[PDB]
Design a protein around this ligand. Structure first.
Ligand code: CL
Ligand code: NA
Length: 129
């Protein structure tokens, strides 16, 4: 599913991400934009052999099981394919664990390089939330 910007903002708000660990909604929308282009089916292979899955590009090195990432963890206790659903519940719940790990949203390289320090409120401008 390719979400609209405001549609995804509404879903992320409903699932409790607005100001989760102090990150406003705009941070999450900005992150999804530059990770996945708001596409739940997005997958990308990392150099280390792991893969990133879904709207927030969650990595099989640590968070999910995709059956092909040796010596990795599954800290969200889910198959990576759950992260490609039209329903973002699994992505959001796993994201909450990630952002709680100690590094906050720096875990998402696209967030650190493209969203951090910017006017992220722009990502939810116009949206009925
Ligand atoms: Cl933090
Ligand atoms: Na894994």
């Amino acid at each position: 599913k390719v979400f609209g910007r405001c549609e995804l903002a509404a879903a992320m708000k409903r699932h409790g991400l607005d100001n989760y660990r102090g990150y406003s909604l705009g941070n999450w929308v900005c992150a999804a934009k530059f990770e996945s282009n708001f596409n739940t089916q997005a997958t990308n292979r990392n150099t280390d052999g792991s893969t990133d899955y879904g709207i927030l590009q969650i990595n099989s090195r640590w968070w999910c099981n995709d059956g092909r990432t040796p010596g990795s963890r599954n800290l969200c206790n889910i198959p990576c394919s759950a992260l490609l659903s039209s329903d973002i519940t699994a992505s959001v719940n796993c994201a909450k664990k990630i952002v709680s790990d100690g590094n906050g949203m720096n875990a998402w390289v696209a967030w650190r390089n493209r969203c951090k320090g910017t006017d992220v409120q722009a990502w939810i401008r116009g949206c009925r939330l």
